Amino acid sequence: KVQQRNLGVSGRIFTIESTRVRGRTGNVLKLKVNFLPEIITLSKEVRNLKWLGFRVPLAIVNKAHQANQLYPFAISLIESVRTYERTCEKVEERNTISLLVAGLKKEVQALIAEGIALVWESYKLDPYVQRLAETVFNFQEKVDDLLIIEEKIDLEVRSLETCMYDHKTFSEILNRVQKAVDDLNLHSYSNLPIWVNKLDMEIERILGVRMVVLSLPRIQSQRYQVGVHYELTEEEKFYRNALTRMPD
Amino acid sequence: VHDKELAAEDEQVFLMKQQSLLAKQPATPTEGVLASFFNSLLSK
Amino acid sequence: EHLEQEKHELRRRFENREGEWEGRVSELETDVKQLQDELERQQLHLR
Amino acid sequence: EHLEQEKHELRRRFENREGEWEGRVSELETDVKQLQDELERQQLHLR
Amino acid sequence: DDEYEKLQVLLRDIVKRKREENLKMVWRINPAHRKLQARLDQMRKFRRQHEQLRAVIVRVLRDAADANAIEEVNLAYENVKEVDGLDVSKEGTEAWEAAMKRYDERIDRVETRITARLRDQLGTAKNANEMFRIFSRFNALFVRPHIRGAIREYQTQLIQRVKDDIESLHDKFKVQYPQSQACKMSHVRDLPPVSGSIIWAKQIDRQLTAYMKRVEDVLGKGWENHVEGQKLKQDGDSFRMKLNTQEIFDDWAR
């Protein structure tokens, strides 16, 4: 069976494959590594059978050695690609955070494209994979953070509808979500002004459903850009416009 | 001026795009201002 | 860049040849082991 | 020049180890051939 | 080694050619100087470690206990020095091994004394600044592995204090520069507002670098990969990127 298969490793490291998934009419394209698990099983069988007196043919042992040469890069590529796929799935789970991972996903896709042109025989594989792995890990970590704090923001939003009508509670809740937005800014998430002004409209709508409100300071977009000489009016500093957002 | 909304492409369209570029990829084997002063002196 | 590629090719060729020779020496050693074992059994059978 | 002399060093090491393995395989081949012919001699002598 | 390899290539070529004249293929070589090579390697490895330890002690332990430890280390070197290191004979090898064992146990005793002093650190120190300065002064001494492993519970305390301080820096930087008293007092002291903002950003950058150096001192070298120093390094990098001032100068010049 092994001689019939005649497995080997060559060519480009990445491949694009079709996979039919129930519920979607279109065939899902996926990025697989050019290293099939059957080669790993072949190497495992070759190295396990040797000590039982089972004389394996020399060509199969040579091919197992060739596969084992590149196995350290292949396993890292496999796990990096799987982590990228799970990161994409996590992003797809929540559609309210897609714009906040534009740069990270773009650079990861750029690295993936750079690696598609790469081949096993090239000498760029050794650093690149490590770089790719690091990038993917950072992406995952970012997305992980981008999930948790965002959920907290949502929780705080849903806590403001039922928030007690007293200035101290409103002030500390808006301070908490402002600190959350500042933390978003610190970790360099793209399109923060878009997401935060959307949150500003949403919380202004909530306050419209709800002087105490008008004295509440607004949620600043980027509280860290200091020294750039720009001014914000009282309307942009507080929810003075909440009087204009009544539903009744 | 509010920044343009940058966004990465979809994974499906991105992979289709990468396949298209792989197909299209053939199988490979494996000063004047300084001069202006100089021009004037030569004429004089 | 071209010389880096060539150095990588020569390095991997050296490792491939080392692995092939290691396998050849291993199988030759096992051939000697089984041959001498059979010789010992047959020498005992002579007596 | 560092890459070039690294390549030449790799070539020299490759040739030297190839010669070592060639010698080892040749002596092993001679040993198994001698043991095979002596084993056949003792087998036909036994009967 | 290189010349012997080059000769061995030629000899293998001759044996392959003149196979009839050379009947066997025995190639074992046991040069007499390899024992001296191993002895010299061992002596070099011992001496570099001892010089590292002695220089560190002379710097950071510059109390009669300090002088006691110093003469203990010097006596260890002297006692190793009495054994003839060049003698590669079996009596010489045994003497060398005994000297190494004696030196190792004496150095371990000195290490225990140093750890006792690093407990006297808390036996004397009261506030966090004093023990910060103590780690700063004793910084090289934690390069040793046993010394580094001795101090484990205080590193977390000082790392949390540095996290509190960099949090305070973050909170200060959240307040915009015109909204801060820095702008008012800079105008009062004749400093122009753009240069005042530049100075404010530069001072925040300087304090960030100082706290990063404090973290390096507390955790020792390789702090970027530490379990607690990874987040600190990431926050420092992002905050330093945000502190870039070139945009202000470009805008003012324009």
What's the full length of chain C, in residues?
47
Rounded to whole angstroms, how far apart are CA atoms A213 and E96?
Answer: 83
Q: Are A148 and A42 in contact (CB under 8 A)?
A: no
Answer whether E235 sits within 8 Å of A186, measured CB to CB: yes
Answer whether E174 sits within 8 Å of A224, measured CB to CB: yes
For A181, the token pair is 């937005």
Distance of CA A110 to the CA centre of its chain: 14
Alpha helices in A162-191 (DSSP H): 167-186
Whether A186 and chain E come into contact, CB under 8 Å, resolves to: yes
E106: three-class secondary structure by DSSP: helix
Q: Count A/C contacts: CB-CB distance under 8 Å.
A: 29
Whether D10 and chain C come into contact, CB under 8 Å, resolves to: yes
To the nearest whole Å, the CA of D30 is away from the closest chain C CA by 11
Torsional sign, CA A214, A217, A220, A225: positive
Q: Are A217 and A237 in contact (CB under 8 A)?
A: yes
Beta bridge partners of A15: A32
For E237, the token pair is 């990098």
Three-class HEC string of A97-146? HHHHHHHHHHHHHHHHHHHHCCECCCCCHHHHHHHHHHHHHHHHHHHHHH
E22: three-class secondary structure by DSSP: coil
Beta bridge partners of A14: A33
* Experimental determination technique: cryo-EM
Beta bridge partners of A32: A15
Between the CA of residue E109 and those of A8, A118, E58, E102, E112, what are the distances in Å? 59, 57, 17, 11, 5
Radius of gyration of chain D, Cα coordinates, nearest whole angstrom: 20
- Give the phi and the psi of residue E205 in degrees, each rounded to 5: -60, -40
Q: Are E21 and D29 in contact (CB under 8 A)?
A: no
Rounded to whole angstroms, how far apart are CA atoms E14 and E27?
Answer: 13
- Give the phi and the psi of residue A30 in degrees, each rounded to 5: -135, 150
Rounded to whole angstroms, how far apart are CA atoms E97 and D42?
Answer: 55
Write out the H or E segment, with its range, that includes residue E177: none
Distance of CA C25 to the CA centre of its chain: 2
Which amino acid is residue E128, in one-letter code? A
Rounded to whole angstroms, how far apart are CA atoms E47 and E54?
Answer: 10
Dihedral of the alpha carbons of E217, E221, E224, E227, in degrees to the nearest 10: -80
Answer whether C8 sits within 8 Å of A61, measured CB to CB: no
Q: Are A174 and A159 in contact (CB under 8 A)?
A: no
Beta bridge partners of A238: A217
